[PDB]
Design a protein around this ligand. Structure first.
Ligand SMILES: [Mg+2]
Ligand SMILES: [Mg+2]
Length: 758
DNA sequence: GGTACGTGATCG
DNA sequence: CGATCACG
């Protein structure tokens, strides 16, 4: 007796928390309320007698004192050992951060546990509730906005000039200037356009609102303009406004009762691109071109009133492709949510490490296993500093016909068979153990470890799904089950990396090294078997390898490689599996996770080399693209070296246009809060002194001028740069922009920074 | 309702 | 050098 859980949160009523579970039941929105769930933490005491002193600990919050409501002695498992801890109950979840350190402080408290779990996620776990279960069909709406922007303006100065939305009914634009198009709704003002978006969202009542970077652009901007205009945005199903949440240094927006699905973090994790522009992303997924209308063109069309039909078509397409992309990427996010038992909102905005931790926390509750704590700043830094033990340095030069092989589906099987877990590492009075090669870590065989045990169930569940897929005549369940087995593969293949994740609860350096040591025996086997087949291995890392058959035909390399994977998988026991990732026409390798390739369709794929960001000048970005194109598209490293020598000489002779020398960097604080004054801050302070309203979010465009001292004293605001009066710093653009951009790439061919000038 | 991550440039 | 700051 349940529908599909889409989210969960809590509200406070008479100072007491009420859990809200948002559900979709046979097409209808339902909200369930729970007033009975209580927040709690665990305390490990030196002796049971101490509970009388410990239960009397107090804190303060909201003018009122905070108390431990009730105490309960519980028997749990910690570090693969029985443990007795006290469950300390509180009235409100905001009581936990107020009292937890007062409890930890106590002389009779050995340690505290499970004290930083958000209340609604604590509820989902403890109540055994899993989001996104069932065949419930959700509704979707893509939303986008276009704003009037001028160089280096304060966030929200310019009005919103268009709002676009799309669904299965089509893509529409709301604007407040006359545009004669079938999909354009013309209203009287920015205020009436924002009120129309509110009306469209309330009427369509979508379960999912899809945006492209709506967390940082569309919704913060809508909220800023709504504030300036004195209007509300009752977008929540409870009529609440979209809520900005601070995630890192960037934002995350939640719309209560709905799933705000921002594609930007999703696409950034899923696919590898030098830029994540909507146009680049759409082309990568659907193989279709999308036209861009730049901010300066939008401003010119709006202010002049000429060429506005072009701007409205761009706004309409932004919503249309946002809808198509959302429908493409949501199914996998929905199955990952269900698998880890947390809402899509949170899961779509998480790293795989955090997905593993949410899976582990729920599994720990189900297995009565006390969860280890997250490290403190000291421990987190020490983990970042730790050195692991075990591949080779890449082959130099430009290689043709490159085959890509993936090793990742090897590691879950190694964790399971060798019982690699923090609870099985170096156990006292162990009867039988596995010793890791080289590294020598001992893993107890006496009981299955917490992680190996879960992994085995994950892998068995995936095999059952795959078996149901072969035996199914229904194409609808085959589709759903395919996303489910893919979600398990993604989660299982994230465990190896998680053991080494410095913020992990079940962090285990020895576990990660041991998996690396056992894994290496299979990587050495793959390498040897490839090499006896005539293959040259050009690059090897724990993730995979790149190989070619020097001087062979491309179809021969493919055929032999495909035959090779088929053969190795037949020799490797169990679920240990090698995967043929792909083929590349050309490629070069600099170091670990620093390489560049080109496929047979002419698409360039790189890792850890490209500088397509606003804080790098166009001259450096343009030169680097030209160097990569000379190498990968022309197969000519001599051309790439000549490109760099020409650009640097042209910079020396002041032959490069100043527009290609601009650096852009955002102001993120009040100017007095800066500890180190970088060039953009030095420029910003001068603007503020002139009367400019400098605020966090303002992007500073500057050019570095010739002179003595650090660059900060020699940087000028772009609007103040006069080509007649000012002279840019050619040495800075050569040595700090152009050469660093290309020196890593060209190192793969034997050139040093010094070889790239006349 | 806890506030990302890895990585590289520049300051102090 | 270590610290500080920004990108996407
Ligand atoms: Mg747009
Ligand atoms: Mg939430």
């Amino acid at each position: 007796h349940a529908g599909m859980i889409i989210d969960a949160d809590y509200i406070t009523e008479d100072g007491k928390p009420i859990i809200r579970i948002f559900k979709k039941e046979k097409g209808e929105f339902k909200v369930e309320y729970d007033r009975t769930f209580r927040p709690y933490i665990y305390a490990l005491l030196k002796d049971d007698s101490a509970i009388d002193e410990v239960k009397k600990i107090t804190a303060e919050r909201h003018g009122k004192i905070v108390r431990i409501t009730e105490v309960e002695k519980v028997q749990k498992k910690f570090l693969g050992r029985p443990i007795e801890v006290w469950k300390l109950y509180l009235e409100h979840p905001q009581d936990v951060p107020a009292i937890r350190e007062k409890i930890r402080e106590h002389p009779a408290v050995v340690d505290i546990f499970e004290y930083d779990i958000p209340f609604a996620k604590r509820y989902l776990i403890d109540k055994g509730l899993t989001p996104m279960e069932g065949n419930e069909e959700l509704t979707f709406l893509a939303v986008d906005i276009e704003t009037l922007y001028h160089e280096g303006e304060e966030f929200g100065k310019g009005p919103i000039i268009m709002i676009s939305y799309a669904d299965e009914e089509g893509a529409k634009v709301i604007t407040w200037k006359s545009i004669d198009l079938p999909y354009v709704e013309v209203v009287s003002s920015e205020r009436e356009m924002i009120k129309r978006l509110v009306k469209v969202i309330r009427e369509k009542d979508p379960d999912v609102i899809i945006t492209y970077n709506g967390d940082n652009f569309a919704f913060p901007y809508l909220l800023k303009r709504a504030e300036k205009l004195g209007i509300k945005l009752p977008l929540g199903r409870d009529n609440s406004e979209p809520k900005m949440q601070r995630m890192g240094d960037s934002l995350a927006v939640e719309i209560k009762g709905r799933i705000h699905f921002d594609l930007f973090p999703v696409i950034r994790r899923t696919i590898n691109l030098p830029t994540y522009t909507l146009e680049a992303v759409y082309e990568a997924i659907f193989g279709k071109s999308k036209e861009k209308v730049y901010a300066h063109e939008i401003a010119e069309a709006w202010e002049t009133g000429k060429g506005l039909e072009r701007v409205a078509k761009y706004s309409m397409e932004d919503a249309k492709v946002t809808f198509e992309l959302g429908k493409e990427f949501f199914p996998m996010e929905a199955q990952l949510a269900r698998l880890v038992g947390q809402p899509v909102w949170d899961v779509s905005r998480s790293s795989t490490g955090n997905l593993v931790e949410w899976f582990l926390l729920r599994k720990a509750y189900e297995r009565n296993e006390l969860a280890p704590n997250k490290p403190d700043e000291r421990e987190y830094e020490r983990r970042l500093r730790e050195s692991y033990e075990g591949v080779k340095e890449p082959e130099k030069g430009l290689w043709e016909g490159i085959v890509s092989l993936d090793f990742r589906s090897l590691y879950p099987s190694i964790i399971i068979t060798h019982n690699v877990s923090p609870d099985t590492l170096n156990r006292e009075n162990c009867k039988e153990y596995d010793v890791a090669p080289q590294v020598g870590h001992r893993f107890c065989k006496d009981f299955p470890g917490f992680i190996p045990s879960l992994l085995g169930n994950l892998l068995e569940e995936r095999q059952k799904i795959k078996k149901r897929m072969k035996e199914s005549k229904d194409p609808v369940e085959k589709k759903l089950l395919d996303y489910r087995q893919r979600a398990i593969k993604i989660l299982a293949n994230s465990y190896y990396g998680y053991y080494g994740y410095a913020k992990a609860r079940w962090y285990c350096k020895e576990c990660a090294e041991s998996v690396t040591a056992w894994g290496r025996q299979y990587i050495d086997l793959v390498r040897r078997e490839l090499e006896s087949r005539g293959f040259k291995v050009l690059y090897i890392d724990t993730d995979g390898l790149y190989a070619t058959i020097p001087g062979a035909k491309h179809e021969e390399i493919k055929e032999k490689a495909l035959k090779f994977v088929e053969y190795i998988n037949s020799k490797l026991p169990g679920l240990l599996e090698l995967e043929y990732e792909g083929f590349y026409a050309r490629g070069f390798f600099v170091t670990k996770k620093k390489y560049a390739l080109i496929d047979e369709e002419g698409k360039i794929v790189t890792r850890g080399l490209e500088i397509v960001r606003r804080d790098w000048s166009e001259i450096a970005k343009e030169t680097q693209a030209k160097v990569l194109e000379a190498i990968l598209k022309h197969g000519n490293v001599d051309e790439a070296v000549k490109i760099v020598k020409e650009v640097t000489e042209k910079l020396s002779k002041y032959e490069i246009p100043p527009e290609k020398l601009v650096i852009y960097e955002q102001i993120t604080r009040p100017l007095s809060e800066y500890k180190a004054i970088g060039p953009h801050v030095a420029v910003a302070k001068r603007l503020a002194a002139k009367g400019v309203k400098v605020k966090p979010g303002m992007v500073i465009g500057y050019i570095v001028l010739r002179g003595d001292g650090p660059i900060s004293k020699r940087a000028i605001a772009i609007e103040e740069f006069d080509p007649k009066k000012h002279k840019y710093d050619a040495e800075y653009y050569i040595e700090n922009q152009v050469l660093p951009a290309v020196e890593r790439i060209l190192r793969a061919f034997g050139y040093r920074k010094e070889d790239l000038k006349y």
